[PDB]
Symmetry: C2
Subunit: 91 residues, 2 copies
């Protein structure tokens, strides 16, 4: 299995831990996507120069805390953050 | 960093190992993208039972091989492949 694959695995795993710990097997509520992100991308978030971006995401995650979401949704939000940070993941 | 953030970074790196080879430096042509996937998702791919999920994506990429896509495009294409392989990323 490839280098790229292994990291993808890593992220699936973490995502998967959250969903299971909070109820469902491969979806996780919005509410607890907000805590995921804020804990796990915290470095990255700090790095974002335009906070209006996560403010949104979040002012959106809070807005409907119970809707389950799947990894694809997850990863997508992870990436949007990622862009806003200019792909700096670092304290 | 964070396990997650460490994985993100590793991924961005792979992407840049690619992006950096031709043309513009933080993007690539879809033709290149198709090459990225063939090599770096190879088994996730050989692990997707519906052989049309990729096929179609690959068609899309051939049909406009010159068009430039960034990390976001990449990643969200990845997300699709992962989902189609129910997250099997080993041979
Ligand atoms: Na390039």
């Amino acid at each position: 299995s490839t280098k790229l694959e292994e990291h993808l695995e890593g992220i699936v795993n973490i995502f998967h831990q959250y969903s299971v710990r909070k109820g469902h097997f491969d979806t996780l509520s919005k509410g607890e996507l907000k805590q995921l992100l804020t804990k796990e991308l915290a470095n990255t978030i700090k790095n974002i120069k335009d906070k209006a971006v996560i403010d949104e995401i979040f002012q959106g995650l809070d807005a409907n805390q119970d809707e389950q979401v799947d990894f694809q949704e997850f990863i997508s939000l992870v990436a949007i953050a990622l862009k806003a940070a200019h792909y700096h993941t670092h304290k």
